[PDB]
Amino acid sequence: MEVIELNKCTSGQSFEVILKPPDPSLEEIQKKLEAAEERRKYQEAELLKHLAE
Amino acid sequence: MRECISIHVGQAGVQIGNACWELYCLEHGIQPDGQMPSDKTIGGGDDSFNTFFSETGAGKHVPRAVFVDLEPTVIDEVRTGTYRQLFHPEQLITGKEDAANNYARGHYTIGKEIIDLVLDRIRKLADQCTGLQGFLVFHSFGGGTGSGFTSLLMERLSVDYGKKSKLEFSIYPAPQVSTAVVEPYNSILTTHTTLEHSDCAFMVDNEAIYDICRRNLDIERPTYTNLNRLISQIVSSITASLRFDGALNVDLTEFQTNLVPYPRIHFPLATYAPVISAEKAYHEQLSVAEITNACFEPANQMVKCDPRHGKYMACCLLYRGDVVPKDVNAAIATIKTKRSIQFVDWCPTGFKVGINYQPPTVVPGGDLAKVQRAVCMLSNTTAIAEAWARLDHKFDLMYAKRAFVHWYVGEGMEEGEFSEAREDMAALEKDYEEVGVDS
Amino acid sequence: MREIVHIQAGQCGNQIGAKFWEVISDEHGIDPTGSYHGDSDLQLERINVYYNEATGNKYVPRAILVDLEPGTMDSVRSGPFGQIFRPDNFVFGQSGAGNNWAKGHYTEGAELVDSVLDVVRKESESCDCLQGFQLTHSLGGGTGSGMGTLLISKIREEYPDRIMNTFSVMPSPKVSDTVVEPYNATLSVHQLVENTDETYCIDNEALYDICFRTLKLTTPTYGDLNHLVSATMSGVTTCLRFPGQLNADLRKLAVNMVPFPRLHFFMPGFAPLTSQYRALTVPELTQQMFDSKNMMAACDPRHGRYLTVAAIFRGRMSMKEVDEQMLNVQNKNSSYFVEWIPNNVKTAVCDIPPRGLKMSATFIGNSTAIQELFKRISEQFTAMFRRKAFLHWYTGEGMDEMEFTEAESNMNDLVSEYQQYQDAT
Amino acid sequence: MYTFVVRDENSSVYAEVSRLLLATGQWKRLRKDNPRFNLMLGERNRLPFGRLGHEPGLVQLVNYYRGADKLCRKASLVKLIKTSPELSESCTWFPESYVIYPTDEREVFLAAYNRRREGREGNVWIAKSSAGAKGEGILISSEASELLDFIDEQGQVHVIQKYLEKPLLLEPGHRKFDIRSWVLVDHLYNIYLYREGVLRTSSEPYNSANFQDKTCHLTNHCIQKEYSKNYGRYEEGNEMFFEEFNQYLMDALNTTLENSILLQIKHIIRSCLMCIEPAISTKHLHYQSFQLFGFDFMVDEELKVWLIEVNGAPACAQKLYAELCQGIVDVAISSVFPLATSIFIKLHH
């Protein structure tokens, strides 16, 4: 039960008590967003082709 | 002094952000017009509250915040609300129509068209910072914007601000206050994509806030307004160390240093006490021992789970009000001899304690009574994995039938992202088990 | 923001559509001349969803009226609220469709469809942010069934990312005009399977049985049937038209109600249905709402399973009591909800009750029991088609038998698809 | 009406409990994976406690206490007794035990073993494991090497325990026995001792000069029914019930079952369950738990009671299923979900 690192100021205080010791790049993001946009475009083109038939 | 930029995404993020900045203004003595009489340095300074507020030459104190939603009805409430004079129009970003509770619509379809605009409005705030710490991101798991657009934003923030810390406040989905059914999908999808980009995330389960409001505030049917004012109190106690003089959690990095030994396991459990009804005419004020003991009651946790059947990696005690170290240690000593508090073997069994002498501030006309002392406990316990297990099971039920999957595929998402995200959650669940359970 | 464009096609479609506008205009305080005379600003908060603002404080329904003969729309223009509609939005021919899907879809309707799309385009271009379309029609005639589904296909071609919902009256031999209704309905259902997001299936036999058995109307008329439909449509659209819990456009609503694209045929219901001054308790509202006698698809929900369920309560009542009663109904009927869509029963409350009731409840069920309705149509279809009876009315308009065989196969597949999700665990 | 789900089909106790619930006309059984239940008759292993108590508006009850395994595993029961101050290393009603891996207590066990042979004391020990099921992994020996060679021969965690060399022997027969007590702990953590117990008796004469003949030493029902030729001779199925056993103690030793034995049994049951109460109580949890326990005891020739083990999923005596399962419905299930001369003894605390 040891208290350590006691710091005090006018606003309050803090301390520690111990009881016992023991990324995707910009281009890759753009690639994924554009890949999904192209899958949307392909699906919509299939719908428009279906409607054209 | 090092600035922090808050980002509020989607309805849940915006409304909670609105609740928080209202409370911040009350705590710092900032009037709705932005003026702050106690601030004697006009148009500048590097006080602790300047981490969250910039200053104009006219003496207005402006939140370092951006609000982004894919439809305008929620942010229009900010534009016309009590604190409308606080924010500049460029801080409030609204789209035309929303993501329809569809992660793929928020991440890919609509996110691609608005991400560059959001980054430019964020960059404008960063340019006013002499030493930017990083970002606090508020959002729901279940919404199409809160899940889909947040994960895209977090990815780009890691590109544009690689050194900066990013903290999340995430609303975990609860059927009691939701009319959606696809939220388990959106939660798993956004957790998978955001996991590597978030340094520390505080999950709030609407189920827990709802029941606390029912049980402790005697509100029969809590509204979002009830929930958000309670959530903003917890958020304020977590961010108070960034906004006031102190020596614990004084910058965002310290949150990871004190609460997250292993990067993927970065979801600390928050517990708050006391929550007292303002309508309660007669109330006896609770002691340091009583509010500290209440931090180990599951009924006061932001996520319902049983820490007795997990292990702790870190524990932080954040007090506000009439609290001195002597009473804290006397309370902790008693609690050890009565509670199941087991740490992992490779961590010290201890508590980092922070005390701010100013008692909690409550909104005039709110549901919460003023108390002489309160505490928020932040503990990294493996018991929070119970919340992942609940979510992953609901995901598994629907995904085995591919229910609702066509909505996501129809927005350009591939089906393999579902299983890739689910396998990542399976690994996350396994990580919690390896840390917290014996053979 | 969140504007809806309404279309009504054919005799049934225009008579039900007109009643719908009578009901919600009264709810919003709009008189027959389009002038507002309400007593609550809640009536105007979401008035733009269905009405346009003309100068002079006039509100004009965003409604397009379509028919291949002038008769019914002449009646509409003479009706109670006839003057409220934009005169430019009456689009009609003279030939009629002779209760013939081919005339509505391929010949007579094809000549008129472009001018309907012109009006649709004009209304859409004046929308701040178009939320989607709704169509009222019957499936058993020629204009609403054939030209209605032609319109839906043309609208999806021009507005491929806009929600399209329908209120579709299904034919019944017991409330029938011609023997070819099963042909027209079967041809139409396949169009709806592909091109709508939600289709509310209103069975004329259910409406008749409700009027006869529950309302004690000895001799129901189409007018009596349409009173039930307009009241149901009002309840179904309550949360779009009034402030409340739901902050959702049509897409968000469809996302949460439609787990598989083709299984989007909904079973609506309404409570109370009384033959009258007595107050209905929340238990009574909830119990009657889930009773098959209060639903309008003539399908027994106990014969299938609910994929998703939504309920809308109207009036001033205890939300706590609403939650308790909804849980009580779910436990009484635990076997009839699929267990692989968690929390698939959702509720919403609106404080504003409909005309003449202190409280009411509207039921929206996506149940696999709707397959019984398609089975009925399929049987009636096959009984005639096996002998190729009455086909000459259709081959005379250029159709051949193969298109009928494909429509039959398409609806039999739809029935099969329902059966597989009713047995899934 | 109430709903319940069955997830352990191999439970004889809760097959009868489920039968009674249905026969009330007020309980409906759902599919095992339907989450909208009030009562879960859960699985023995990996019961998903984390998914309980999150269904809106449903009070949910489960027939197992999360964390009660610490009492119901042989290795963890030894650890619990040694490391809990309320039980302590000096506990008088539990035999000297050590945990042995093939942490580990190999050297400490050898230490007390060496001292025991110094004073020429009885140096017989029994090695057992909870993973070894139904009389398999048991070995009794008076020499430590045979125990440890048998332990590391197996890959499972074992416990070596002092073998009670002086057991109370029933007459006629000169025969061993053990006492099974059934204990129900409800959601309020009331501790109910079923008034009816059973003695699982050996039908062979006890022979302390041969620990390889494990039929007169192991009082298991499966071991007696298979290996003992005198099975069922003195009592049906080698099961003597409290009325006869009490009459025997009065006739043979001029005392009663209540005085000589049952006071200690109640003390032990109460000490074990009160010890783990803070760790497993569901008093302020979002779901509630109850559990049926099977305590197994030994009695020595001095009428001292020793706890042997605690079973977390016990079976019941054939003639006692009806009464006990009705009691489970009464005090554990209907207490939370009420319907439209108690058989238990409440151990107070």
Ligand SMILES: Nc1nc2c(ncn2[C@@H]2O[C@H](COP(=O)(O)OP(=O)(O)OP(=O)(O)O)[C@@H](O)[C@H]2O)c(=O)[nH]1
């Ligand atoms: N605590 C709290 N939760 C909220 C609030 N608003 C929404 N939620 C929760 O957030 C989830 C729905 O996500 P939203 O934030 O509304 O959706 P969104 O982020 O705006 O994204 P969209 O789908 O495009 O509308 C549900 O689980 C709601 O219960 C709020 O103000 N407070």
Ligand SMILES: Nc1ncnc2c1ncn2[C@@H]1O[C@H](COP(=O)(O)OP(=O)(O)CP(=O)(O)O)[C@@H](O)[C@H]1O
């Ligand atoms: N220390 C000891 N001294 C004397 N006998 C002992 C003993 N430990 C165990 N026994 C004997 O071994 C038998 C079975 O022991 P144990 O309870 O460990 O096995 P088990 O768990 O498979 C039976 P159950 O599951 O029904 O409780 C007991 O009936 C008892 O007679």
Ligand SMILES: Nc1nc2c(ncn2[C@@H]2O[C@H](COP(=O)(O)OP(=O)(O)O)[C@@H](O)[C@H]2O)c(=O)[nH]1
């Ligand atoms: N409920 C209702 N059904 C109608 C009405 N008018 C016609 N029907 C039904 O609609 C079908 C006939 O279609 P109808 O609309 O009259 O033909 P159309 O003008 O070519 O579209 C039959 O099934 C009729 O039973 C009506 O006013 N109300």
Ligand SMILES: COc1ccccc1NC(C)=C1C(=O)CC(c2ccccc2)CC1=O
């Ligand atoms: C998940 O949505 C709900 C949850 C609880 C209670 C009610 C809801 N509303 C639901 C479930 C819907 C819809 O599907 C579409 C409806 C509609 C249909 C046709 C034209 C206009 C509007 C509006 C509507 O209100």
Ligand SMILES: [Ca+2]
């Ligand atoms: Ca200043």
Ligand SMILES: [Ca+2]
């Ligand atoms: Ca980073």
Ligand SMILES: [Ca+2]
């Ligand atoms: Ca012509």
Ligand SMILES: [Ca+2]
């Ligand atoms: Ca043209």
Ligand SMILES: [Mg+2]
């Ligand atoms: Mg939104």
Ligand SMILES: [Mg+2]
């Ligand atoms: Mg007609």
Ligand SMILES: [Mg+2]
């Ligand atoms: Mg055993």
